[PDB]
From a paper:
In this study we have designed and tested the properties of a new protein scaffold based on the OB-fold of the aspartyl tRNA synthetase (AspRS) from the thermophile [name]. We term these small, single-domain engineered binding proteins OBodies. To demonstrate the amenability of this new scaffold to engineering for new binding specificity, we developed a series of OBodies with increasing affinity to a model target protein, hen egg-white lysozyme (HEL). Sharing a common range of epitopes centred on the HEL active site, these OBodies were also found to be efficient inhibitors of HEL activity.
In the third and final phase of affinity maturation, six residues in L4 of AM2EP06 were randomised and selections from this library resulted in the isolation of AM3L15 (KD = 30 nM) and [name] (KD = 3 nM), constituting 8- and 83-fold improvements in affinity over AM2EP06, respectively. The highest affinity attained was 3 nM for variant [name]. The interface between [name] (KD = 3 nM) and HEL buries a total 1800 Å2 solvent-accessible surface area (SASA; 923 Å2 from the [name]) and maintains the intimate association with the HEL active site and substrate-binding groove as first established in the NL8-HEL complex. In a general sense, the primary interface residues are the same: a hydrophobic patch at the centre of the interface composed of Y33, V36 and I38, surrounded by an inter-molecular hydrogen bond network and electrostatic interactions. In contrast to the NL8-HEL interface, the [name]-HEL interface shows an increased number of polar interactions, (going from 10 to 15 inter-molecular hydrogen bonds) and the addition of two salt bridges. Residues W90 and D91, located in L4 of [name], together account for three hydrogen bonds, a salt bridge and burial of 195 Å2 at the interface. A very clear rigid-body shift relative to the NL8 binding position is also maintained in [name]. In addition to the protein atoms which interact directly, the [name]-HEL interface has a complement of highly-ordered water molecules which mediate both intra- and inter-domain interactions. In particular, two clusters of ordered solvent are closely involved with interface residues, with one anchoring the C-terminal end of L4, and another larger cluster arranged between critical binding residues Y33 and R35. Overall, the improvement in affinity, from 250 nM in AM2EP06, to 35 nM in AM3L15 and finally 3 nM in [name] is correlated with the stabilisation and recruitment of L4 into progressively more substantive contact with HEL.
Residue numbers in the entry:
A (entry chain A): 1 to 129
B (entry chain B): 2 to 107
The structure:
Amino acid sequence: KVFGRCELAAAMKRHGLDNYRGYSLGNWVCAAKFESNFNTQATNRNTDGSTDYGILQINSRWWCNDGRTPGSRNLCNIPCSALLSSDITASVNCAKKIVSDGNGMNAWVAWRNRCKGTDVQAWIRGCRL
Amino acid sequence: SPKKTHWTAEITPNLHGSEVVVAGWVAHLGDYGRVKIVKVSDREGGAAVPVYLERGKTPDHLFKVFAELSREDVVVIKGIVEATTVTRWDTGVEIFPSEIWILNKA
């Protein structure tokens, strides 16, 4: 499923991401934009044998199990396929663990390079939240 | 092994752009895929400086060294300091390494 900007902000707010670990909703919407372009089916293999999945591009090395990644930890205890549904519950739940690991949203490279330090609220402004 | 030039508490935003060599133990490890973060300390009850490995920016061979890393390992790290805003999750400084030496496994 390809979310609409405001559609996703509403879903994320509903799932309690607004100010989670101190990060305003805009951060989460902005991260999704540059990680997956709002596409929950988003799939990308890395040269190291790991893969990133879903709206927030969670990695298969430590966080989800995809059955083909060496050194798998599966800390989110969910199969990577569950991160592909049009229901973002799994991605949100896993992201909450990731963003609580001790480095904030610095776990997301796209957020670091495109969102961090910018006017992130712009990504939810207008929408009826 | 290069020679220590700063203590982790001595790594401050002022050093932005300059090369430093830190030496201590692995306080924390984070593997998030395209980004890996290793925190290094050399003094109990002191600062842990975040060392950053980012695909497309960090030399690929360092990602192998990181894979052999464990908490409490003693390391020596040469890298460039980059300044950041202090937050709940940001020390105000980051090190982008060019070398990562493992002196001792826990």
